[PDB]
Amino acid sequence: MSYLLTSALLFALGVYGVLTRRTAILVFLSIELMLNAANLSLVGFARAYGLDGQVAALMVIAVAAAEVAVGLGLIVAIFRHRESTAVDDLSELRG
Amino acid sequence: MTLAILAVFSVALTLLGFVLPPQGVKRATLLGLALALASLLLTWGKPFAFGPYAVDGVSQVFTLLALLGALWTVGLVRSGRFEFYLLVLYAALGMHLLASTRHLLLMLVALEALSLPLYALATWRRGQGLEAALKYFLLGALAAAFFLYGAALFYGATGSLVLGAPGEGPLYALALGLLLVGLGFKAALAPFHFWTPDVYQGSPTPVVLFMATSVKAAAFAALLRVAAPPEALALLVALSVVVGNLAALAQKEAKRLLAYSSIAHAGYMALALYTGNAQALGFYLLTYVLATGLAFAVLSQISPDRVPLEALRGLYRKDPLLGLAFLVAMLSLLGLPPLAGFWGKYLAFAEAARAGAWGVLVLALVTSAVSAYYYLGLGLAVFARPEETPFRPGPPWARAAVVAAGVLLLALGLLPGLVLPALAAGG
Amino acid sequence: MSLLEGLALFLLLLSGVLVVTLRNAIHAALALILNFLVLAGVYVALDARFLGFIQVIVYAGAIVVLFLFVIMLLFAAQGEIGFDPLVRSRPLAALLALGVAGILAAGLWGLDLAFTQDLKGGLPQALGPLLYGDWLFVLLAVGFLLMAATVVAVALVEPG
Amino acid sequence: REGILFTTLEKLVAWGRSNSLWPATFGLACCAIEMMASTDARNDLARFGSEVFRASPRQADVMIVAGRLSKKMAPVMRRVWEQMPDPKWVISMGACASSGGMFNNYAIVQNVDSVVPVDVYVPGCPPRPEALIYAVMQLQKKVRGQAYNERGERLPPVAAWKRTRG
Amino acid sequence: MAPIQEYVGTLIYVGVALFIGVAALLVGALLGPKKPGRAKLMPYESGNDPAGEVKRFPVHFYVVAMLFILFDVEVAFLWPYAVSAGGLGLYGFLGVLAFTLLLFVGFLYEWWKGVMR
Amino acid sequence: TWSYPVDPYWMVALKALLVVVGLLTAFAFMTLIERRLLARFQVRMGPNRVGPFGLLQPLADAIKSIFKEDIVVAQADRFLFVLAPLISVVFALLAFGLIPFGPPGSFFGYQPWVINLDLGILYLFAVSELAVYGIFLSGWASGSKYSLLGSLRSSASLISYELGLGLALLAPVLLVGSLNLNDIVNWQKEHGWLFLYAFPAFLVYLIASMAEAARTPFDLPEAEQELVGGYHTEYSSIKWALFQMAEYIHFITASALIPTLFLGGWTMPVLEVPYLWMFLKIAFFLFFFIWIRATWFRLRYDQLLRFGWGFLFPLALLWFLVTALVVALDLPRTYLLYLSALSFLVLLGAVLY
Amino acid sequence: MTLNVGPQHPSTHGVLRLMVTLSGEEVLEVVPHIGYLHTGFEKTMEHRTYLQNITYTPRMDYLHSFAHDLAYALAVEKLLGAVVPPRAETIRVILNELSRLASHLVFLGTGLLDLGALTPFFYAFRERETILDLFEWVTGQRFHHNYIRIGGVKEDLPEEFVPELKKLLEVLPHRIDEYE
Ligand SMILES: CCCCCCCCCCC1=C(C)C(=O)C(OC)=C(OC)C1=O
Ligand code: SF4
């Protein structure tokens, strides 16, 4: 149970990352932290409920890898020409 | 047995774009989507299950809606970049996989597989489009994190990751809420709706068409499978409809206002989740798909980049058929008799009242009455004096499509007793 | 067990503190890699062994390497640039962060379960038959997702 | 701590340094081809310890000044000598390096001892490679404290220890 | 399976090795002339500005590394198939075959598009 | 670890220290032997000096490397600069104990190995990635964009071929069916010399093994002769020694791994002596690789990546799918004998035109 | 990368300074900077005897030096109307082309070494040493030989030279074929 509570704490920490971090790339880092804490909880419950959560966590890692590739391509595309990746400077579209 | 054709055509055209011009790639994409649609028809009421992949009425109808939207949005784009269409097939398949399963993890895989090409296809190089894509991307990945923690706590609450499992108390409710967060975010339910206005304003008009039809369709196809409790459902509906319409009042731009209207319509659709009829919701989503596809086809004929409200006025004088279809669509999104949008509205409200949640329904109905302001400010201006406005009078393809959509809306407003039987398992 | 497990958890927690705290992208990435190393250790401790070594192989070896490459190609080391500070967001989100902890803590406390099943070690030997078989369809879906992600990134740059 | 002031250790460490001399060439001119020849397949500086040749200055102790030193090139050599690890020696290869040689004019520094502490000189134009071998032998037996000048003195083992650098 | 104590031994290995490693650094630190000067700290090459200030270096490295993450994911998928192959019979193989095509297409894709980028 | 016993903790730690000092002595003597072999190749001679036979040069070098002003460069990151050599050295030293030098008890009583983890190749794969980690982390840490370029090339190339390693090494696991190397060795004892079956994949492994700093990708890069490589150009006394030491350690590690997997890990068909034949094959690969060190040019890592990407890895995956097809149908193994013999004959006969 | 390919580093033979304006692995534009070896021949020669100047001419291009000494000799001979005996001329072309082969040998050695393989630097240089011995046989110097004179040559070739030159001329073709 200590491991799953630790997963909760790490998920919360990655949430504070995404809320806090100013630059796109560090936000993406926090996103990976969150997803991997989730996979930790999956591993705990996979130990508990019969081993399916392990293959689950593997597929989750693959998904995270794919969306990391695309998200980093995008982060590059926006701020290769542009100034700092900092996301608070993007306010053109307002409600 | 549709997935066979989807995989075949996707993989084939993927490589073929290297040897074949993008125009031929587009022709092949249209043929592939049409053949997938035909396969869906010939499988009407013929469930096919191999793994957790389960073809049922929900998957059938909702994926048919998404296929129609994809066909329509492919019709418009003439890009000399075949990639701008390949993702469509990809995206299409993703949404299909979202509907055809109850498995949370494969549902997540389908979510990402359909959402990534959406993130990419909103890039006309237009500066605001990139901001839109980035905001959408970050919020989508956050929602995937939420849904994944919900799946983890679900696998904790039950030995399987399939919905409908017995379910515990507070832990199962917690998992349900964590799943509902991401799913409603994807379905434009408040207070998880913030992404939709920015995304619809920034994204190119045909892409917004494809999204506002197929994304919401597949999202609700997934949502119906959840055991969504009444209380959270009520709160999401109330806030969604209220915020959507009220803030929609002040909008000066067509596409953004359509985004807020789609948030309010997500609020409306979320009622059937009380009983999860999925037949009445199927019909509701059919009407909405027709209306929104029509309206955004018009918006794409006018301007892919951006359309302000005033630009639409006088649209009747140019083309009468289009003006009539646009006004019919305005009513269908308002839910006014004798149009099928009212049929979907009434169906969702019946499913709600049967569950016995009243005050939320009252608030929803008052807000729908409020919506008449802008539904009219768009419908009625159709006759007003046209100011200077760019108009490119379309091909015959889109004209026939818009006319067919309007005729279908009026018919199913008059004669819904045709399709509604065949929105269950095939009764 | 608990003796070293507590220390491992404290290392994980401190690594998370840094990976969300440190302003230097490189410092952050290294903290994350130490996190994944400890996390693979925990996985192995949790009778799931193959997954921890794939975690070190793929995530450490492949991805956060690429992140390092990007933050070195895109300097970005002093992330705190272009502030638009919104200082109110610093504590507030933390409370929301605290919120998102407590609820989950509330969600999982008083929960004791069957943490004893004969997995016989999470070797890929035993992972195969589930993977190819019952789970083969998810595998094909993942492969298709990867194919789509490749094409997406390619068309995403594709200068003309 | 400088490896000094213990009867056994200083002898041993100086022995080691002497035999492990890692040259960092500062190739300038025609002497440098004979310097390359000091390792060739007929007369190789591949025994005394100077086989390995890290042209980087962060990985070498002995600096072999091989050629004419134009004045624009002087401060470069100044830094490159300064850009060495501190136990460093400067060997002056060729006539042009030690004195002005036949080029006694505005173009060349007339004594390298101006910018860097020169330890050992080796005349010749060019010095036969074996003159470079004898020069590195001079420096070798020097750092052991086994070197005497015509004044008779024991000379300090390391030059670049005797300068108020600045 | 295999005993867990061996994995424990692995950790002990690092504990010793790292320790001697750190010890080496300590030795290297203590035995030194330690004569700090401005020019010794200079980055490189004669006065200032070895590279200087320019625009960002090529993302080609990002391309290679992203490629690598996806294909290493592929390899991590292939190993469980590599171990348990016969017991799954042709059926099992069939999946990975189609699977391979998918990522192979990806590779083939990036081959027919190429990276001069 | 079905069939293999376990030693006490204290003996594990002491074996660790023993392997450390043995790698010190061994890599020092192999630096000597590389000097001498390079010299012997180019008709010039080695150090007939400070020996008698030259075997006192490493001591002089080690004495010089210390006292050599271990420097902390200003304008460089304070902590990472110190930390990186430790990373590169530690993650190079470890992950060599797994390689068995004999049957159990052939260590004068206990055990040839240190640890015999059930998942060997995965552990090796991880530490292979982490060595390059240390390398280019040092490259950045120096704060010289000169060395930055070199560290970038290093990581890119080595990691590309680190990918290709898996698509190569799949096949022998298919045949053996275990991830503990000792099972693979015993497999090579009964059926024999795995490489005979897997020549093509073996090739793309050998070429891949060249990438891990051995020589001729040779855009490692070395500080010498090109845009200076990473992990040096800023290190003076002990850290530079640590870097090159770890590079040599990984060198001999690969030269020992290649025989164990594909060829005949010690386990000789004839005369079956525990250590000596393994050390002889290690020295053979070392001599071949030093032959390469002397004999060939650079690659610029652009054509190198084109080569690995388009040529090596498709070949490795093709062979892997063939082997998996066979094992799934399992009808004979002989079809692989036939196809591998033909593959070697083809990859050779195209030379003699 | 406003990169400073410095003088003599990185191991660029022929010490030269390059300001490579560069992004990535291409080459945008290299701004050359020289002046780091200017010795002042064209000035000092205004203060040296004609005969003396043969002490100066070869030490500029140290690979193909005897071509410099030969060009100087011919220039002055044409200037003051000098006559070269045919033997002097023949030995002149022989030693000059011999230093031509020496130059090409070191050229290929340093080329392959600077980027590429290190081994073939030695064999060529091995042969080069024989060439150098030849010069030491006749001129008493490895290279930079002060042999030619305005009228002709310093002195005759010693008795021991010619067999060594034939030896080298007999072994060289196989050597060159090997390199090719
Ligand atoms: C085994 C390594 C031996 C090389 C030692 C000398 C370093 C290389 C630069 C020296 C050099 C200079 C100055 C030089 O001017 C020159 O001629 C253009 C060379 O070769 C053709 C040189 O090699
Ligand atoms: S002393 Fe002679 S060989 Fe040496 S640099 Fe001067 S001119 Fe050249």
Residue numbers in the entry:
A (entry chain K): 1 to 95
B (entry chain N): 1 to 427
C (entry chain J): 1 to 160
D (entry chain 6): 16 to 181
E (entry chain A): 1 to 117
F (entry chain H): 2 to 354
G (entry chain 4): 26 to 205
Quoted passage from the original study:
Complex I (NADH:ubiquinone (UQ) oxidoreductase) is the first and the largest enzyme of the respiratory chain, catalysing the transfer of two electrons from NADH to UQ, coupled to the translocation of four protons across the bacterial or inner mitochondrial membrane. In bacterial complex I the 14 “core” subunits, necessary and sufficient for complex I function, are shared equally between the peripheral and membrane arms, together forming an L-shaped molecule. All known co-factors of complex I reside in the PA: the primary electron acceptor flavin-mononucleotide (FMN) is connected by the redox chain of seven Fe–S clusters to the quinone-binding site (Q-site) at the interface with the membrane domain. In this work we address this question by building and analyzing atomic structures of nine different conformational states of complex I, which were obtained by X-ray crystallography and single-particle cryo-EM.
In contrast, binding of DQ substrate to Q-site, in the absence of NADH or NAD+ in the NADH-binding site, promotes the rotation and tilt of the entire PA, including subunits Nqo4 and Nqo6 near Q-site, correlated with concerted changes in the region of the nearest proton pump, the E-channel. Other key residues, such as H384 from the key β1–β2 loop (33-QHPSTHG-39) in Nqo4 and M516, also contribute to the stabilization of the quinone ring, while secondary residues are involved specifically in the binding of each ligand. The presence of DQ in the Q-site significantly alters the conformation of the Nqo4 β-sheet, pulling β1–β2 loop (residues 32–39) about 1.5 Å inside the cavity towards DQ, allowing for stacking interactions between H384 and DQ. The opposite Nqo6 β-sheet also shifts in a similar direction, but the strand flanking the Q-cavity (P386 to F416) remains in place, thus effectively moving into the cavity and narrowing it. Strikingly, this coupling was the strongest in the CXIDQ structure, because it was augmented by an additional edge, extending from the Nqo6 subunit. Despite the overall similarity of water networks, we identified one notable difference: only in the CXIDQ structure we observe the presence of a single water molecule nested between E32 and E67 of Nqo11 subunit. Thus, placement of water in this position leads to the formation of a unique continuous path extending from Nqo11 to Nqo14, that is, a path connecting the E-channel and the first antiporter.
